[PDB]
């Protein structure tokens, strides 16, 4: 469809003691789902959350992600609204608490998509009559200007904008506020209407976007497992994101991938994030068993966990009773090509062939550029089921090759005239 939003998901979360013998493949397969809109927008959603020695029977995913694809008056795709939310609190083993937190997480996301206003007006309408952080954006083609993207981040979500060669252009950074007693927690969408200092909480950027730009939104469950970087710290505020050099290396794979799906991009980041998460939790329980041998290298390992006077007994209780991981969600969007979307509309809506025919002349500089457009459309893949387990993904061609070839021949003939 044009509108897709993740549904309430309750999974069985095995303990670290059970996951400590499992490979990455098994860990991902039991914990993550693919929610697909098209080749150019996909969601991966799941939970890496685990107790050291106890299984979590009802592990409710408190993250939501959603998209509404928008069209011009002719029905040609020209924009989208995208939101990712992280419900604050929960994961304690109370279903009533998790249900309440999920309702706010989901409605926050849903309300953002259903609003038809610019981002600043949208945030005002959905923040007036349980907390959730939100990272969200609106892009739209403005005939004179091209694509303009409005970006909003409240809390510890993260948005990264790349070009078509996976060069990092912009980052809408995560935020933590100091709460006292050495603890930093993200602001919520709901906190925005309770204070005059909306800047201190709301990160806003308005950006010109190019065709084929990649926008990645992640909850801290995904990007927090990658190598992180402190961007800035004031008195009571921290600006945090991914190490840009490390994040760039994640795409080394796709360097020669002709037109990679949003799914493939999301999968690669999710795999690396959960690899580090799985190895992190392997190390912890083995270190715990290693420092139980003491009976009161490893030093740099023990140092790395704690620092990124407390009595030994308290630390061990902490490490042995600790939950690891979190609700982990990522959405990936490709900014559409003007020519590709006009061709999509021409094929899907052959009734509107007269109205669309005049628009091709402006969007076709050469036959080479037409061939480029039909090449991208040739490579588009869709998940016939909107949702399925990440390891049970089945993808088929968006178009019949024979349909694309006949349309290209017709359009090529008319260009050559
Ligand atoms: Mg949360
Ligand atoms: Mg989170």
Residue numbers in the entry: 20 to 148, 164 to 330, 352 to 363, 377 to 485
Task: Provide passages from the article that reported this PDB entry.
In order to obtain structural insights into Lem3, we crystallised the full-length protein comprising the amino acids (aa) 1-570 (Lem3FL) and a shortened construct (aa 21-486, Lem321-486). We solved the structures of Lem3FL and Lem321-486 at 3.6 Å and 2.2 Å resolution, respectively. Lem321-486 differs from the conserved PPM1A fold in minor details: The central β-sheet core consists of two additional β-strands (β1 and β19), thereby broadening the cleft. The spatial orientation of the additional α-helices forming the thumb shape a deep cavity located at the interception of the fist and the thumb (referred to as the hollow region). The base of this hollow region, which is located closely to the β-sheet cleft in the active centre, harbours the metal ions. As verified by CheckMyMetal, these metal ions are embedded in an octahedral cluster which is characteristic of the coordination of Mg2+, Mn2+, or Ca2+ ions. This metal cluster is surrounded by a scaffold of oxygen atoms provided by the side chains of four aspartate residues (D82Lem3, D105Lem3, D254Lem3, and D394Lem3), the backbone carbonyl of a glycine (G106Lem3) as well as six water molecules. More precisely, M1 is coordinated by D105Lem3, D254Lem3, D394Lem3, and three water molecules. M2 is coordinated by D105Lem3, the main chain-oxygen atom of G106Lem3, and four solvent molecules. Additionally, the effect of the mutation of D190Lem3 was examined since it is located in close proximity to the metal ions, suggesting that it could be involved in their coordination.
